[PDB]
Paper text:
[name] clinical isolates express the [name] adhesin, which consists of a mannose-specific lectin domain connected via a pilin domain to the tip of type 1 pili. The [name] lectin binds specifically to mannose moieties displayed on glycoproteins at the luminal surface of epithelial cells. Mannose binds in a deep and polar pocket at the N-terminal end of [name], in which the amino acids Phe1, Asn46, Asp47, Asp54, Gln133, Asn135, Asp140 and Phe142 create a dense network of 12 hydrogen bonds with each hydroxyl group of the pyran­ose ring except that at the α-anomeric position of mannose. The interaction of the aglycones with the tyrosine gate formed by two tyrosines (Tyr48 and [name]) at the entrance to the [name] binding site contributes significantly to their affinity, for example with a 400-fold increase for HM compared with α-d-manno­pyranoside.
The Y137A mutation, on the other hand, is the most detrimental to [name] affinity and specificity: (i) in the absence of ligand the [name] C-terminal residue Thr158 intrudes into the mannose-binding pocket and (ii) ethylenediaminetetraacetic acid interacts strongly with Glu50, Thr53 and Asn136, in spite of multiple dialysis and purification steps. The ligand-free state of Y137A [name] permits the C-terminal carboxylate of a neighbouring molecule to enter its mannose-binding pocket. The Val155-Val156-Pro157-Thr158 peptide of the [name] lectin domain from an adjacent symmetry-related lectin domain makes a significant intrusion where the oligomannoside glycan is normally bound. In addition, an EDTA buffer molecule is bound in different alternate conformations into a cavity on the [name] surface. Remarkably, EDTA was only contained in the extraction buffer of [name] extraction from the [name] periplasm, but remained bound during purification and dialysis steps, which did not contain EDTA (see also §2). The EDTA binding site is very close to the mannose-binding pocket and the two sites are coupled by residue Ile52. The Ile52-mediated connection might be needed in WT [name] for proper guidance of the ligand to its binding site. Ile52 is also the residue directly linking the protein-intruded mannose-binding site inside the Y137A mutant [name], with the EDTA binding site formed by Asn136, Thr53 and Glu50 at the protein surface. The Y137A mutant structure allows the binding of a macromolecule other than mannose in the [name] mannose-binding pocket to be observed for the first time and moreover exposes a hitherto undiscovered adjacent binding pocket on the [name] surface. In the ligand-free state of Y137A [name], several of the binding-site residues (including Asn136, [name] and Tyr48) already sample backbone dihedral angles that are normally only found in wild-type [name] upon binding of the mannose. In the crystals of the Y137A mutant, a breakdown of the binding site with a severe loss of specificity is observed.
Residue numbers in the entry: 1 to 158
């Protein structure tokens, strides 16, 4: 089991970490959601699908910088919604193919009442998402750590 980002950075068997640089909507009004869809940026595959089933969770998601200060969050994982920053590990998603498939994570971020101006600075760390990978054969328990960085400013107009 291994993962890759949309620009080709890999995390190999056994886990590791990588940076993910994401374009964000440059403006988000009070009452609207800023969507950070990681499913178009993070992909994973099972190397030996005839031999083993791999299981994948969002073990935890943390917010940083302007996301932590200026937004109220939820994370959708494989169709279900949870608080973001997270308070529990999600259910497991099955990976059963050598073809890379999306990691089905999206953040829904709406401005807090105090947000105004540049609410996320371009280049800043906005999130760390920990993917936990297990399997149905042995006790392997691997962490794939995704450090999410903003490519551009996000403005909340005032
Ligand atoms: O997980 C696999 O793909 C192969 N499994 C078999 C698990 N299968 C049972 C079966 O194929 O009859 C679970 C499944 O139904 O996918 C071997 C193992 O026990 O580690």
């Amino acid at each position: 089991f291994a993962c890759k980002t949309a620009n080709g950075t890999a995390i190999p068997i056994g886990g590791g970490s990588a940076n993910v640089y994401v374009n964000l909507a440059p403006v988000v009004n009070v009452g609207q959601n800023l969507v950070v869809d990681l499913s178009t940026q993070i992909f994973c595959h099972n190397d030996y699908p005839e031999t083993i089933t791999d299981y994948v969770t969002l073990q935890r998601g943390s917010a940083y910088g302007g996301v932590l200060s200026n937004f109220s969050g939820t994370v959708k994982y494989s169709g279900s919604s949870y608080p973001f920053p997270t308070t529990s590990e999600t259910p497991r998603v099955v990976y059963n193919s050598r073809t890379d498939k999306p990691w089905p994570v999206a953040l829904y971020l709406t401005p807090v009442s105090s947000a105004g101006g540049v609410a996320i600075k371009a280049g800043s760390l906005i999130a760390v998402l920990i993917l936990r990978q297990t399997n149905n054969a042995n006790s392997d328990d691997f962490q794939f750590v995704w450090n999410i960085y903003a490519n551009n400013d996000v403005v909340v107009p005032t």
